[PDB]
Design a protein. Structure first.
Lengths: 276, 223, 278, 230
């Protein structure tokens, strides 16, 4: 159906790792290729890869990284559209790119559209993070890395922990992941958008963070949101970050709130005189 | 030390190199020549000195704010203050240059009303700028001279100019923020601003869209 | 139920222009091509299901992304929304001044789109600058697949956009005038538009005959109207793609390879990027 | 006068975007003679990089205007004279920075980190002088740039891991030297791709902060390699 014959994809430079390792490739233009560097996949890696392909074959949206095909012959591989640019994690914490509040709002709106689509197709991403958000031509948001994604059909199949909700981190029960865990990850990415930094910035260790978020003793410091961030956006992120799953909002109304707030456009933080 | 055309060419070249101090020096020389400037020469002088002074206004605001957040540290606040007064001196010298050029060449040689309202507006704007950093004993005087020039231009503005005319739309914008910021008269500033915006909506093509957007942002934030 | 969208989920907005295309809201913006008929006739339903079948095989950055279909109120194809006018609009109605580098890039993206299409044995049969859309004047998107097909032995059944039709397609004298080559000739015409700034056969007095002369071969595009900075390789490639006889024309892998190669010998616009201040 | 007062007023000049003041403050701090701290080093680097970047951008603009002005000989003469004014400013800035390096910084660099950082800064400022040097002194400046770059490169590969941000930035700047100044794309892409691939190998081995520091330069290396092969 979407299988790509061996030999058609010219694989170029190794660019990094994913949930496999990612390279650049040429196939009717540019493509990205996530591939597994093993001679013989184990049944668990082969089932994981088949599940990821199954999920991606249901994703068809402008703000979702466009899946283009898969290959099995040399090694198992998922191939997507190529995105010139960097991840949103890179822009926020690796180059400190000065984004205007308008572009931050637009990035949040496009991410919300992507996760509205995903949840409307009963897909839970289970690893939504600023590193898995890519900017195409520094203009369009593309949600990527579906290696931990699934469809919700009443069965559970199974370092980046800042986006993990307390339930997920607590591990009280075997099936923590849900729409609300994704909503909390989204809350964390809005935290990143509106503060410019990661949450839990001052607690340095990585292991205690888990205990504190699971218990509820620690939550993101919403006082580090910058003053030009609309109040609605801070309210929405607070709603998406609430400690108990059942009080968090759903993505249709998260999207509706971002859409309504999209249109409101206060360019003026303070008053402003006539320019050139 | 060269022809007016040579200075205008070096001014345009400094403009494209974003070296606003050189362009300002060129246009200052061009105005000390004594002849009336063209619309282009007027615009180059405006851009040059507005950028030169805007850099200093931005630095002053940043360093003043940082002055506020000195808590329990004499020497930190002392350093921030002395730096603020250094910036203050540069800001004043620049504004004094611009106001001397305005009073000795620009306004007297303005043939049409447009030129002289523009130069009186610039007169008010630079007094504005000086006002924002004014100490308090001379502050009153500077504010008085600001409003005198502003209003003097304002009187001629809606007497020969169409509501769509960008120069007055800007004169209105600067006079309204003058009332709101420099003084404390929200009622007057909002009254004037809404009056001008509604008169403009009633009756340059792209310039006025954005100046009405600046008016709508101003009133939106003041109310 | 695989790509079908339940009725009520799509809010249809303004009419913007095949079937009456409108703007709609569905998890963001979408474009909706909709036939405004209560009950589809069996030819319209065959065409519509054929188009959906073709679109469900297209998954490429330079193909207008098919997102789903609907049948409940009326039959409807839904795609992503692309902010920006057609290439025809930018070239001949607003005369947007494109640099030669951007024209080469536009040709490269269209070539990628039809390399992908032909690699999945899809013939568009209506490739023209009107069916090429610009996404924020940055990405090219091939669209309007109402006349596209998978090449099958028993391939079942043009209006006025005659200038992208290959001579054999005008003649309809051949057993199958639609082919990979006919699309390549339409592509040659779009490159003609790109390098000329004008539609082909501009300086011509009579109009109905022009069909007759291109069908005979008396008429071919005037390549002398190509602008002087157009790379010579690009002019030659257009000539190759527009030759009167189907079998002297190149294939899209070779068109794509040559357009890609030319872009590398194009001088660079931006400069290098050095270590930024920490 | 105090070293700490100069560093603090340098940071305050950085916040007000008055890079000439920050540069003067840091020049005083380095003229005091003591080894700079990492923060003091980075403030000096940022200050002079902004000071010289303004002139580099203006030089590029007026040079382009100079070559693209054909008919007017008087306008082209004025653009030439303004280009030489900007060039003179550029040279004075670069000679200031190279004097600071040669007279104070290099001898007090105990660790290898410091000496690769300062030799790379020397290569960068000689490279900025190469971007505008014409004919007679061009070759000398290019040779001194390449020599400093090469020595820093050797010390990088001998005492710094491939992911070290200073080594990655040295690779990036040396590749840009090869591409823009010597006009030899093959050697520049070779160096860039080698450094990037060797860093990508070990990239998983880092901390989040080391990862931010290394990735910021690795993304620039991959942007350059994408752009040089396009």
């Amino acid at each position: 159906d979407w299988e790509i014959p061996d030999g058609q994809i010219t694989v170029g430079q190794r660019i990094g790792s994913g949930s496999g390792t990612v390279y650049k490739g040429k196939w009717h233009g540019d493509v990205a290729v996530k591939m597994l560097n093993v001679t013989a996949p184990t049944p668990q890696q082969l089932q994981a890869f088949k599940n990821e392909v199954g999920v991606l074959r249901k994703t068809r949206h402008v703000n979702i990284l466009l899946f283009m095909g898969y290959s099995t012959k040399p090694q198992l591989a998922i191939v997507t559209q190529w995105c010139e640019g960097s991840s949103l994690y890179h822009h926020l914490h690796a180059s400190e790119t000065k984004f205007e509040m308008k572009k931050l709002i637009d990035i949040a709106r496009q991410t919300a559209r992507g996760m509205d689509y995903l949840h409307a197709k009963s897909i839970i991403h289970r690893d939504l993070k600023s590193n898995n958000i890519f900017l195409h031509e520094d203009n369009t948001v593309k949600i990527g890395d579906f290696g931990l994604a699934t469809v919700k059909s009443r069965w559970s199949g199974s370092g980046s922990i800042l986006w993990m909700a307390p339930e997920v981190i607590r591990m009280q029960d075997s099936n923590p992941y849900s729409f609300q865990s994704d909503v909390y990850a989204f809350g964390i990415v809005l935290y990143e958008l509106m503060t410019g930094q990661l949450p839990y910035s001052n607690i340095n260790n990585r292991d205690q963070i888990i205990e504190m978020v699971g218990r509820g003793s620690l939550s993101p410091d919403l006082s580090k949101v910058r003053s030009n961030c609309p109040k609605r956006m801070k309210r929405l992120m607070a709603e998406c970050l609430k400690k108990k799953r059942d009080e968090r909002p759903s993505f249709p109304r998260i999207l509706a709130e971002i859409e309504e707030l999209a249109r409101e456009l206060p360019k003026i933080h303070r008053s402003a005189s006539e320019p050139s | 030390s060269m022809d007016k055309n040579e200075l205008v060419q070096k001014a345009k070249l400094a403009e494209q190199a974003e070296r606003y101090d050189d362009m300002a020096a060129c246009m200052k020389s061009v105005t000390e020549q004594g002849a009336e400037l063209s619309n282009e020469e007027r615009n180059l002088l405006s851009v040059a000195y507005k950028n030169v002074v805007g850099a200093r206004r931005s630095s002053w605001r940043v360093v003043s704010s940082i002055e506020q957040k000195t808590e329990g540290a004499e020497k930190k606040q002392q350093m921030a203050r002395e730096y603020r007064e250094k910036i203050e001196t540069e800001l004043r010298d620049i504004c004094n240059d611009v106001l001397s050029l305005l009073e000795k060449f620009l306004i007297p040689n303005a043939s049409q009303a447009e030129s002289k309202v523009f130069y009186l507006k610039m007169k008010g704007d630079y007094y504005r700028y000086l006002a924002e950093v004014a100490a308090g004993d001379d502050k009153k005087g500077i504010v008085d001279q600001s409003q005198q020039a502003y209003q003097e231009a304002f009187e001629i503005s809606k007497k020969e100019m169409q509501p769509t005319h960008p120069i007055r739309l800007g004169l209105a914008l600067n006079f309204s923020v003058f009332y709101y910021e420099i003084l404390n008269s929200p009622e007057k500033a909002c009254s004037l601003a809404k009056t001008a915006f509604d008169e403009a909506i009633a009756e340059s093509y792209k310039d006025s869209t954005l100046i009405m957007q600046l008016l709508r942002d101003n009133l939106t934030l003041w109310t």
